[PDB]
Enzyme design. Structure first.
Site, PDB file in Angstrom:
ATOM      1  CG  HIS A  52      -0.134   5.327  -0.931  1.00 28.11           C
ATOM      2  ND1 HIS A  52       0.385   5.614  -2.187  1.00 28.11           N
ATOM      3  CD2 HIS A  52      -0.014   3.997  -0.756  1.00 28.11           C
ATOM      4  CE1 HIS A  52       0.860   4.488  -2.715  1.00 28.11           C
ATOM      5  NE2 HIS A  52       0.586   3.482  -1.868  1.00 28.11           N
ATOM      6  CG  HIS A  96      -6.814   8.130   4.997  1.00 26.56           C
ATOM      7  ND1 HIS A  96      -7.748   7.128   5.026  1.00 26.56           N
ATOM      8  CD2 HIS A  96      -7.143   8.928   3.957  1.00 26.56           C
ATOM      9  CE1 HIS A  96      -8.600   7.296   4.008  1.00 26.56           C
ATOM     10  NE2 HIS A  96      -8.255   8.403   3.376  1.00 26.56           N
ATOM     11  CG  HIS A 103      -6.705  12.679   0.992  1.00 26.93           C
ATOM     12  ND1 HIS A 103      -6.086  11.751   0.166  1.00 26.93           N
ATOM     13  CD2 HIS A 103      -7.697  12.011   1.613  1.00 26.93           C
ATOM     14  CE1 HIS A 103      -6.707  10.585   0.269  1.00 26.93           C
ATOM     15  NE2 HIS A 103      -7.671  10.692   1.152  1.00 26.93           N
ATOM     16  CD  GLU A 117      -8.842  12.465  -1.811  1.00 28.64           C
ATOM     17  OE1 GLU A 117      -9.549  11.636  -1.248  1.00 28.64           O
ATOM     18  OE2 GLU A 117      -8.082  12.244  -2.766  1.00 28.64           O
ATOM     19  CG  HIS A 142     -11.299  10.687   3.452  1.00 23.84           C
ATOM     20  ND1 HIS A 142     -10.586  10.587   2.290  1.00 23.84           N
ATOM     21  CD2 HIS A 142     -12.122  11.739   3.305  1.00 23.84           C
ATOM     22  CE1 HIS A 142     -11.048  11.481   1.420  1.00 23.84           C
ATOM     23  NE2 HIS A 142     -11.947  12.244   2.036  1.00 23.84           N
ATOM     24  CB  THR A 181     -10.407   9.401  -3.328  1.00 22.70           C
ATOM     25  OG1 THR A 181      -9.636   9.240  -2.128  1.00 22.70           O
ATOM     26  CG2 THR A 181     -11.771   9.980  -3.016  1.00 22.70           C
TER      27      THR A 181
HETATM   28  C1  LIG Z   1      -2.088  -0.567  -2.294  1.00 20.82           C
HETATM   29  O1  LIG Z   1      -2.766   0.570  -1.735  1.00 20.82           O
HETATM   30  C2  LIG Z   1      -4.225   0.608  -1.554  1.00 20.82           C
HETATM   31  O2  LIG Z   1      -4.909  -0.180  -2.208  1.00 20.82           O
HETATM   32  C3  LIG Z   1      -4.935   1.592  -0.607  1.00 20.82           C
HETATM   33  C4  LIG Z   1      -4.006   2.576   0.092  1.00 20.82           C
HETATM   34  C5  LIG Z   1      -4.602   3.900   0.597  1.00 20.82           C
HETATM   35  N1  LIG Z   1      -6.043   3.948   0.617  1.00 20.82           N
HETATM   36  C6  LIG Z   1      -6.717   3.952   1.735  1.00 20.82           C
HETATM   37  O3  LIG Z   1      -6.134   3.924   2.835  1.00 20.82           O
HETATM   38  C7  LIG Z   1      -8.194   4.074   1.624  1.00 20.82           C
HETATM   39  C8  LIG Z   1      -8.733   5.316   1.237  1.00 20.82           C
HETATM   40  C9  LIG Z   1     -10.105   5.534   1.133  1.00 20.82           C
HETATM   41  S1  LIG Z   1     -10.783   7.018   0.789  1.00 20.82           S
HETATM   42  N2  LIG Z   1      -9.576   7.933   0.457  1.00 20.82           N
HETATM   43  O4  LIG Z   1     -11.699   6.875  -0.359  1.00 20.82           O
HETATM   44  O5  LIG Z   1     -11.426   7.434   2.005  1.00 20.82           O
HETATM   45  C10 LIG Z   1     -10.918   4.362   1.499  1.00 20.82           C
HETATM   46 CL1  LIG Z   1     -12.665   4.420   1.453  1.00 20.82          CL
HETATM   47  C11 LIG Z   1     -10.379   3.121   1.884  1.00 20.82           C
HETATM   48  C12 LIG Z   1      -9.036   2.962   1.978  1.00 20.82           C
HETATM   49  S2  LIG Z   1      -8.213   1.510   2.459  1.00 20.82           S
HETATM   50  C13 LIG Z   1      -9.207   0.143   2.002  1.00 20.82           C
HETATM   51  C14 LIG Z   1      -8.693  -0.237   0.619  1.00 20.82           C
HETATM   52  C15 LIG Z   1      -9.266  -1.537   0.090  1.00 20.82           C
HETATM   53  C16 LIG Z   1      -9.155  -2.652   1.145  1.00 20.82           C
HETATM   54  C17 LIG Z   1      -9.740  -2.211   2.485  1.00 20.82           C
HETATM   55  C18 LIG Z   1      -8.979  -1.008   2.969  1.00 20.82           C
HETATM   56 ZN   LIG Z   2      -9.117   9.338   1.746  1.00 18.93          ZN
END
Ligand SMILES: COC(=O)CCCNC(=O)c1cc(S(N)(=O)=O)c(Cl)cc1SC1CCCCC1
Ligand SMILES: [Zn+2]
Ligand SMILES: COC(=O)CCCNC(=O)c1cc(S(N)(=O)=O)c(Cl)cc1SC1CCCCC1
Ligand SMILES: [Zn+2]
Lengths: 260, 260
Positions: free
Chosen positions: A64, A89, A91, A102, A115, A196
Site C-alpha cells: 500500500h 509512510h 502517499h 491526500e 504521515h 485515510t
Molecule cells: C490491512 O491494511 C491496513 O489496515 C492498513 C495499511 C496501511 N495503513 C497505514 O499504514 C495507516 C495509515 C494511516 S494514515 N494514512 O491515515 O496516516 C494511519 Cl493513521 C494508520 C495506519 S496503520 C494503523 C492501522 C490500524 C492498526 C494500527 C496501525
Molecule cells: Zn497516510
C-alpha cells in the site's frame, strides 16, 4: 483485499471496512471558507525524534505504501495526552500526474504527502489497540512539492531499491525525523478525522503543517517509480502509484488553524 | 436506497450498485496533466432544442434531483450515432456552501451543474435499455457559477415550489433548451465515463462545456431551499442539498479537448 485501483478500490472499501462509509472521514480539502483561527493551538514539541544512529529501523513495502517503523520513545508533546510514534509512510501520484497528496489546499494537490503516525500511549498499550478507540491516534502530515534536492528525505529514498516488492524489508540507520518536517511547524491545520486507509477508523487527530517541504524532480520520480504493490513472483505486477484517497465531503465543520 | 449523506452515501453505493466501485467513474477533476487537444472534436449541433412554448414538459422530483423530461425529437447531431434527449437535471450544494458542481476544474467546484442526458437512438429503443450498453448514453454538462440572474434557468426554477417532495410532478411550458448552454459551445472537454448516480454504469460519453453559465445567488438559494429527498408525508424529512458525487480516480483515462 484493498487497493487504490479497480474493483477493490476506495469506493468498495466500505464493504469489508464499514468505517470507510461512516463519519469523520479523511482526507479533506483545506479551503478558506472552513478555516477558523484558534489561539489555543500552541506549537507541538517533537521529543525523541533524533533516532539513535546506533539503532536500525525496519523499512517495509506493505503493498500500500513504504513504511518506516518508529520507536515508542519518540513522541509528540503538546497535546492533552502523550502520543507515541509507531510508523511513517507516504502517499504519491504518478509521473503523468505528479499530484498525489491526500489533503488538498484550496482544491490543489501537492506532489506527495508524508504521515507520521502516533498513538495515545497514556491511554493505550500499542497503536493497534488505540486505532479503534477514543482519542486513539494523532498523525502529523507534511505536504511535499517539487523543488530543491532534500538530503533528509534521501535518508529514506536511498533504500527504496531494497523494498521494490510487497513483503520486502530493509533497515534504515536512525536519523533526525524532525529533518522531514517543514519550516514554521507552529503553523498548522487541525481537525478530527479518520485513517485515510482501511479500516478508516474515525480516531485520528490531524495536524497538517501549513508549509510544504521540497524534494527534487529526481527524488519525486524515484518515489513514484521505485515500488510495486505486488509480490516479487506475481505474474501480473502492479506499480505502486496513485496510493492516495480522494477528498471526502466535510460539511457543517471547521478546520482550526494555529495561524491567522 | 441511496443518498449523498451518511450511511447510504457515496462511499457505500458500491455495496448495492457494483458499477459504482468499478472502472471509468464520473465525475472527474479537469486539470492540465490529463488534458489532450483532439482536432477531430468538431462542433456539436443541437436539433429540436427550441421546444414550443405552447407545449408542456413534465418536471419531477425523483428524490435525488429535479428532472425535466425531454422529447426524443430533441437530439445532438455531430456524434458517431444520433443521441436523442431523454431528460435534464441538476446538482448543487447548500445555502451556506453554494459549491455543488460534480465536475471540478483545477480542483475548484462551480456553484452547480446541469446534465442533459441523451441515449443512442440508432441502437436502442429507450434510455433505460441504452444505459447498461456500450456507447449507450451521451451527457452534456454545463458548469454553473454564481453571477447574473438567468431568465432561461428561471423557466425551470419558477416551478420548484410545485415539486417540493419526492414523486411530485408539474408541467413546465417549453422553452429553448439551447438557452441553458454557455457561450462557445464548440469548446468542450470530452471523455468516457459513467452515470454519477447509481447504478453508475460506465456507459456515458461526457461533453463538459469549457465555459460556465451564470445564475444568481437568489436562484441558487431557491434551488438549495425548495426541495426535499423525501415524500410530503415523511416524518424524517431530508433537504435535497449537496446532491453531487466527489470526483473519481482517472484509471489511466485522458480528457480530450476541442480547444488547444
Ligand atoms: C490491512 O491494511 C491496513 O489496515 C492498513 C495499511 C496501511 N495503513 C497505514 O499504514 C495507516 C495509515 C494511516 S494514515 N494514512 O491515515 O496516516 C494511519 Cl493513521 C494508520 C495506519 S496503520 C494503523 C492501522 C490500524 C492498526 C494500527 C496501525
Ligand atoms: Zn497516510
Ligand atoms: C438508481 O437509479 C436511479 O433512480 C437514477 C436516479 C438519478 N439519476 C439519474 O437521473 C441519471 C443521472 C445521470 S448523470 N448525473 O450521470 O447525468 C445519467 Cl447519465 C442518467 C440518469 S438516469 C438513467 C435512467 C435510465 C434511463 C435514463 C438515464
Ligand atoms: Zn447528473
Amino acid at each position: 483485499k484493498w487497493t487504490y485501483f479497480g474493483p477493490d478500490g476506495e469506493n468498495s472499501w466500505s464493504k469489508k471496512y464499514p468505517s470507510c462509509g461512516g463519519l469523520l472521514q479523511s482526507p479533506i480539502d483545506l479551503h478558506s471558507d472552513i478555516l477558523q483561527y484558534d489561539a489555543s493551538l500552541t506549537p507541538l514539541e517533537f521529543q525523541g525524534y533524533n533516532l539513535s544512529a546506533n539503532k536500525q529501523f525496519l523499512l517495509t513495502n506493505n503493498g500500500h505504501s513504504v513504511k518506516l517503523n518508529l520507536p515508542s520513545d519518540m513522541h509528540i508533546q503538546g497535546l492533552q495526552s502523550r502520543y507515541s510514534a509507531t510508523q511513517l509512510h507516504l502517499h504519491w501520484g504518478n509521473p503523468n500526474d505528479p499530484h498525489g497528496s491526500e489533503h488538498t489546499v484550496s482544491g490543489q494537490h501537492f506532489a506527495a504527502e508524508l504521515h507520521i503516525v502516533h498513538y495515545n500511549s497514556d491511554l493505550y498499550p500499542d497503536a493497534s489497540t488505540a486505532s479503534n478507540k477514543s482519542e486513539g491516534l494523532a498523525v502529523l502530515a507534511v505536504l511535499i512539492e517539487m523543488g530543491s534536492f532534500n538530503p533528509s528525505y534521501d535518508k529514506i529514498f536511498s533504500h527504496l531499491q531494497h523494498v521494490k516488492y510487497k513483503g520486502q524489508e530493509a533497515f534504515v540507520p536512525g536519523f533526525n525525523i524532525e529533518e522531514l518536517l517543514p519550516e514554521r511547524t507552529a503553523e498548522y491545520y487541525r481537525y478530527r478525522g479518520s485513517l485515510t486507509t482501511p479500516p478508516c477508523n474515525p480516531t485520528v487527530l490531524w495536524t497538517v503543517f501549513r508549509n510544504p517541504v521540497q524534494i527534487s524532480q529526481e527524488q519525486l520520480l524515484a518515489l513514484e517509480t521505485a515500488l510495486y504493490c505486488t509480490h516479487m513472483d506475481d505474474p501480473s505486477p502492479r506499480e505502486m502509484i496513485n496510493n492516495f484517497r480522494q477528498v471526502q465531503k466535510f460539511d457543517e465543520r471547521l478546520v482550526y488553524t494555529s495561524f491567522s
